[PDB]
DNA sequence: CTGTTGGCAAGCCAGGATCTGAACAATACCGTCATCGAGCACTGCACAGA
């Protein structure tokens, strides 16, 4: 596994089907959650990788940190410890999860190493994000309602995967040229190219459904609520 | 063998209205996680004794 020479090594091990019930949520330490109210009581839920692994090379700890800053989530108690020791000192994540189908991982995302214009570059990447899922959700909701079958009433997940992995390949350029003078434009240009990305995504995940004249206009909505956020989105 | 030149080519005025443009029914399913032990199959294994 290490390719480290060692004394002992283990070849093998022995399991059994064990079953019990935890009741409540344990006040685990570790992980930011999300707080949602049903009913009149408050409900929590660890955050995890659901349907995308929101990741960027070289910052993926600031895109997490970001999601959980700003998107009910709440930070990790150890995170929340060291808030209130140093209010003013910068943070930064050591981090990780893992994208599953039950027993099958499907991704893994870890930041493990040992700055506001790298804030706002994650911060104008999440704002499109938010306008592609939006957009494509709205498609989803009304391929659904129009009694659609088939990938249609998900389509705002794959277009959120394909989003990062699309717009990872524009970081490393953005991040070799930003400095004092420069970044303004570089983010300018960021956007450009992520606006451009989005209608792109948008188009193919919606170009399967071409010829439904009955979705034409959940089609309408969904691309009239995209450019509604795009348009938000430029300073 | 030898075949030409000048001068000249128009203007007026006029192009429409009525009224009409559809409806129904139907858009799929499967597989591409894993666990455990049991009940029940190929499948060769020599043989012992036929
Ligand atoms: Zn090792």
Not at 44 to 56: D, G, I, Q, R, V
Not at 212 to 231: C, F, G, M, V
Request: contains cysteine; positive net charge.
């Amino acid at each position: 596994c290490c390719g480290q020479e060692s004394n002992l090594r283990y070849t093998g091990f022995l399991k059994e089907k064990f079953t019990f019930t935890v009741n409540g949520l344990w006040p685990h330490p570790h992980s930011p959650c999300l707080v949602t109210v049903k009913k009149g009581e408050v409900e929590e839920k660890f955050l995890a990788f659901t349907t995308s692994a929101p990741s960027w090379t070289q910052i993926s700890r600031v895109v997490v940190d970001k999601i959980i800053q700003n998107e009910g989530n709440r930070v990790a108690a150890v995170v929340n410890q060291f808030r209130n020791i140093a209010p003013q000192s910068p943070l930064e994540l050591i981090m990780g999860g893992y994208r599953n189908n039950q027993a099958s991982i499907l991704e893994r995302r870890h930041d493990v190493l040992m700055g506001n214009v790298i804030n706002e570059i994650v911060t104008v990447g999440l704002g499109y994000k938010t306008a592609l899922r939006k957009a494509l959700y709205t498609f989803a909701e009304g391929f659904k309602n129009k009694d659609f079958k088939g990938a249609g009433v998900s389509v705002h997940e794959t277009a959120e995967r394909h989003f990062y992995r699309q717009s990872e390949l524009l970081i490393p350029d953005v991040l070799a040229n930003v400095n004092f003078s420069q970044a303004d434009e570089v983010i300018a240009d960021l956007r450009d190219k992520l606006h451009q990305l989005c209608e792109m995504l948008f188009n193919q995940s919606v170009a399967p459904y071409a010829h439904h004249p009955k979705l034409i206009s959940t089609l309408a909505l969904a691309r009239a609520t995209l450019y509604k956020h795009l348009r938000e989105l430029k300073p």
